[PDB]
Each structure stands twice: as C-alpha cells, then as structure tokens.
Symmetry: D4
Subunit: 118 residues, 8 copies
C-alpha cells in the first residue's frame, strides 16, 4: 500500500477490503476475464487505474475509445467470473458510499483465449 | 425514507443509491429470487431487515437457523438474478465502507415457483 | 422420535416413512437446497416445523413474510434436488391423506452457495 | 367415481385429491410422459391400474416384464413432466399413509414422440 | 435361434443381422431405454415380441393401451439411446423389405431411473 | 422411378418405402445435413448413388478419399437431422435384408452453413 | 513441399504459414471435421485440392454436386473445430491477398462418427 | 479510403476485401464483441489501429498492458461473434501473405453488457 501512489490509496484500501481472497494471489486460476471502465473524466479514471493493482486484479493505463465528447476508458483485468463482476460492484460501492466520486458506466468482459498475466 | 425507522436510515440511503433502477418498482418481473443473510448478531440483522424495503427488494423479519451459538438470519427477497447478487454485494459494500458494521456471511437464493409479492 | 415433541409425531412418523434414505444422514452431500412453506395459519406451520428434523432435512422456526392478513412461513432445508421436491410432495401427501390438516402453499428453493448445516 | 370399480376407490379418492389440476383435463398439453409401476404382486398392481383413470392421467392393464419370480407391471400415462413424477410421489404417499398397502418400486418415463391419447 | 419359436425366426434372423454389436450383450451399459410398438393387430405384435429377445434388447408380452378399436402394444427394452432408435428403424426396415408385414406406429422411450434387467 | 436407371431400382423402391414423408419434398426445411458412405467397392457405391435421388435426399457422384487400398465414397445429402440418420439406417436395412449387397461403413454429417440445393 | 506438385505450391506455402501448429500432425485428435469448397471452376478447385495435404488437414479429389451450370466441389478434412473454420478463413485470405484467384463459396462441416484418417 | 491515412492503406484495402458484408454497416446488431491485439512493437500496432475503422469494426488507440519488456496493445471492436474471430483471422492472413509484417498474438473478447458504439 506504501508503494501505491497516494491519490488512489482511499480507493485502494476500500477495494482491498471489499474484494478479499478472490482479489489476492490465486495462481491456479487463468486470467480469461477483465472489466472495462469507460467515462468522460480522465482524472477519475486515472485514479481508478492506480487504485487497482493486485494479485488477482490488474488494471492497464487510461485509454481512449473509438468515436463515430472524447470517451476515456481503463480496463481492469481479473482471474475468474466472480472477481470480474465483483470489481464492477466494487466501484459502484465507492460511488454510492463516496458521493464526491464521479459516476462511471462499465461492462463485464470475457476473453476466450488466456491473457499473459502471471 | 421518512417512513423507514431511523436506525437503518444510514443503510437505507446507501442501498437506495447503490441499487438504483433494478431495486425500485419493476412490476413486470416475477419474484423468483431472495438472498439470505445469516449472522450471530441479532442487532445488526434487525438493522439490515429494516434497511431493505423497496419496490424490487423486500426483507422479512429476523429468524433463527436450524442447530445440529445461536444463528440468526434474515431473508432479503428480490425480483431477478441481477438484483439478487447485487444486494449481496450491497451489504459487503457497507461492511467495507463502514468498518464499525459487523461481518455477515450470506448466499444467493433461487426459488423455482414464484412468491406472493406484488 | 421420543425426543421429538408429541404434536408433530403423527406427521413425523409419516414423513419418516415417506422420505426414506434420501431423508436420513447423507453427509457427502452439500446442502444447497431448502423448501419454504408459507401459510396464514401459525398453528399448523409450527407443527410442520416440529415435524421436520432429520439427518438430511432440517426446518427452521416459524417466520413472517413481507407485506406490501399476516403470512407466516417456515423454511425446510434439504440436501439435494431430489429431497427438496420430495418434501414438498411429502406435505401434500399428508394434506390429501389427512383432510383435517390445513392447506399450505409452497415452492421449492435453490441456494447457490452452500449452507452451514452438517 | 361411481363409474370406477369399488376396490380402487380408496386409492382413487386419494389420488384425486393429491394430484389436483395437473391431474384433470389439460387438453393443450401433449402426452409425452408415462410412469411404470413394477411389482411382484399382481393383486395390488391391478388395484393401482383401476385407481388411475383421469383427464391427465391414464393407466394401462397389468403386464409382465422380461425375465433374464415373475415381475408384473402397469404403466401410468401422464401429460407433462410435473404429473409424471407427481404420480410416482402419489403412490409412495399411499404406501406411507396406508401401511397395509404393498411396496412398489417405480421409475419415471419419458417418450420422445407423442402418444395417441386425447 | 433354435430356442426362439419359429414364427418370429424370419424376423429374428433379420434383427440379429441389422442390430449387430449394440444389440448383443453389453453389460457395462445400464438399461434406461425402451421402445413401445403399438398397433391394432395382436397377431403381428406377438410375432414382434417373440422376435426381440437379445443381450442388449428385450421385449415384454403384448399389452393393451388406455382407451378414452382396441389398441395393443408391446414394449421393447434397450440399453442406450443408439439401440433405442435403431430398433425403431429395425422394424421399419422389415416393413419396407417385407410388404406382407403389417404397418406399426411406434415411439422411442426414455426412462429416468434404471430398470431391473441384467 | 422410370427415369431412374434400372440397376438401382431395387434399392430405389426400397428406400422410397423406407423413408416416407421425410424423404420427399419438404421445401420449408434447409439442407444442413448429408451422410457420407465410404467403401472399397466402386460398383456398389455407384449403385447407391443412383439409388438416392429424392425431394429431401440427394446423392452426389462417387468420389475418392484421402490416403495417408483405394477408398471410394459417395455423399448423400439430406434436409434435417431425422432424415440424415434415417438414410444411414436405410442402407443397413438393405444390407441385412439383402445379404448379397456389400457392407458399407458410414457416418452422419452436419454442415453449419446451408447448402445450395432447392 | 518438393513432393507437392508445383501449381499449388504458392497456395501450399501460404496455408503452411497461415495454419501453423493446428495444421500439422496432431495425432491425439480425432478427425470429426471437414470443410467443403464448392465452385463452378474445376481448375481452381483442383489447385485447392493439391494445395491442402497436411498432418492435420487433408483434401480429397474434385467432385460434382447434385443438380436439381455444373457445380464442382472438393472436401477438405480437418481434425478439430478450430482448424475446420481456420481453413475456411485460410482460403478467403488467399482470395483477398491474391485477387487473380477465383471466388469460392464454402461451409464448415461436422461429422458425428470419426473418419478413417490417421 | 482516401480519408484513412496512407500507412495503413495496404492493410485497409486488404481487410476491406477480407471481411466483406459482416465488416460494413450492420446497425441492427449490438456491439458485444471486441478483439485485443497485443505485441511488443508499437509501430505495427499503430498501423493496425489505423487499419481498422469500419461500419462493423472499430479500433481504439494503442495502449499498454499491466506488467507483473513493455507490452503494447490495441483493441479492435466488432458487432457479432462472427466478425470477432474473423478479424483475428484477418490479421493472421496479412502476416502469412506479407512476411515483412510483424507477428502479433491476440485473443477474441466477449463483453456482457453492450458498448456505446453506433
């Protein structure tokens, strides 16, 4: 937690408690699952990206989405189907608990072939 | 919210924000789903029971469980499979956000035949 | 049977014969299943609750249901899907065989995560 | 009930109450389902055959089974999957309720193509 | 074949060739499957019943069907789903090959619980 | 039948009777299904190919198979899953009924995208 | 590649690179799968047939299709469901990359019983 | 094609031909599907990102992946399951056809909730 930059620490401590065992170091599992968080606010999305780094849950850098109002997004990568939806619920928890946090719309994601994270 | 007794109001306001549309008045849906919250603490379970009364989510009174340390439990009844697990996540959110709240272990529940709530 | 209070003994002896092996002591099985009996009559529901205590089948205390005419209910917890529906049929048997017994409407119940009874 | 011969009347009245709506006249349903009752006793099987004649449930005459102690059997034909298992439970009810009745072992049966009963 | 009565021998020799391995002595398999042959002609149905006796396929005696023109039927019991439909095709083969044989309408049958033949 | 060359007429008349409705002109159905007949004998396979031409069943010309003893094969194209296996049984019928006919080993075939026959 | 005739070598080298491991020598797998390429051009279909010979992928000789404009076709036999569709994509790749090549319409094929290639 | 920057034009023209109808303007479909291309080379990934912009297929900007040798990735978003795998095959086609192009490893991706592209 000391290693994680300060800005996302309030979030980090929250998610660390929220997720539990399914969020920390389950090597046997394969990572087939991620969850994309998209929002117009780059600031909060960066905080979210910093917020999730774990044994079972990792998040990439902030990224733009295809435009047919720029949409920014950050993918949050998980192990199983449980933690995939649980992270989605983890953020909504923070939004409800902490009103000052922005509202982010997200969808669960399933990958067929495994991803290179272990 | 004025009608709901005070003790569960902090919880109520939380869940009211957490759940959203799937937690309020969806008449078309049939109630096949509930979620049981079991814990040794009657006090917190009573607060939980008072906490959930909604259009899509209703909770019965506190009840004991069969003993082969008395276990108390309160069922929380939902509409669909989404709100069933979402309520389970809603409580865990409160526990993580508010540390002073007790730890309650729970399981999602599926009913075959419909239940008389509309 | 001597231990079980008298009032539910006529029922108990009935269910003991009706259920058989699937109703007595199957430890290998996990309890994912229960069956809720709801009715307006507290008296008969109490008798039902006393009636079911077994190795594979356990019943909690009488409990109220959420009101949008008070409805009382008693959950009857089972091991597998077979005994879950079989108990539902076991009560209907008693109602048909013994006319004096009240009419109780019930639904089979499925739980996702296991329940703490062994 | 007057038309049904006397010997199976005690059974008939029982099953008539036990089965209910799913046992009487549901024309929309197709008969894909039957249930075979096999036992060594021809006497009781004949009584069973006389016992089941209904709108949704019909039973053929007593019949022998292939021998690799003669086994006699009587098929009981139903509409849906509900009534198929319900009849199986209906007999077990009679055996438990009435001890003097013999013990009959039976299995539920599924037919792919429909059967000529309407 | 010498043991099998003469009348069904032309049929027997036919089915013996038609069915093959799946029709003779597969003990590992459980008998969940039968096929009912129903027809108005008792004579041909008796010949059919005599025609099928095998390691994997057995047929009971001729039996009547429930009447809402008497219908007679004979069940032919199999091991797996393959032989169940194969026997249905085996008879149709005989009808097409031998025109003098009567036309019999039949359906494949599935049993949930196993049957006492081994 | 007059149009079909003579050599396969004995077969043709057989299959015409064996197959019935599912073998003649069902336009609503899509052809997703064929059945491949492979054998070392080109002569009999040619007769088989001539034997099957129908509204619901069509057969292509005799063709070789990949060699890692030349294997010849002829595909027989059907409408639904019923007629696909039924044709497989139709040939086995001929082999059993008529001993002089050669023994041909075959497998049912399923195609994902539809085939250009209507 | 030296053994394969020259005309299909440009194709062969292409498919050899395109397919990879799933296209070369996987003995453990069973061949349940093929893919049929149909087209009006016999010339290109012959080139295609010569083009595919592999450890995991084999193609038979050019063959006609049933006519209710002669259609020629060549089946390409695979191991698993992956290579079945991959070959279909492999040809489309060649058509897009090399414009001079003809346009061939094809469908993936599934066989129930295994095929004699190993 | 004039609008698309030059560097990815050779790719663009290729994919435009490869994909066809399923790659251009199918509004009725919902976008549940994307495909992630990950590789160590930022240069080629940028070319890939520029290469895919279509009615049915859109690609976001180049993005990094979580590190437990920096991995860069670019997501390519599709409509249905067909185009999702087809794009994966579309790139492999280019790699096989054009050797000078780098080798990129990728996996198909499924999203539960729809994505905001129409």
């Amino acid at each position: 937690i000391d290693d994680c930059p300060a800005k996302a620490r309030p979030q980090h401590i929250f998610y660390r408690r929220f997720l539990g065992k399914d969020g920390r170091r389950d090597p046997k599992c394969q990572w087939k699952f991620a969850v994309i968080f998209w929002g117009n606010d780059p600031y909060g999305l960066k905080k979210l990206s910093q917020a999730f780094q774990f044994g079972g849950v990792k998040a990439g850098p902030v990224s733009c989405l295809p435009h047919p109002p720029i949409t920014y997004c950050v993918y949050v990568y998980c192990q199983n189907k449980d933690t995939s939806k649980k992270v989605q619920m983890a953020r909504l928890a923070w939004e409800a608990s902490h009103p000052l946090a922005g509202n982010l719309q997200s969808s669960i994601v399933k990958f067929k072939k495994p991803l290179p994270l272990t």
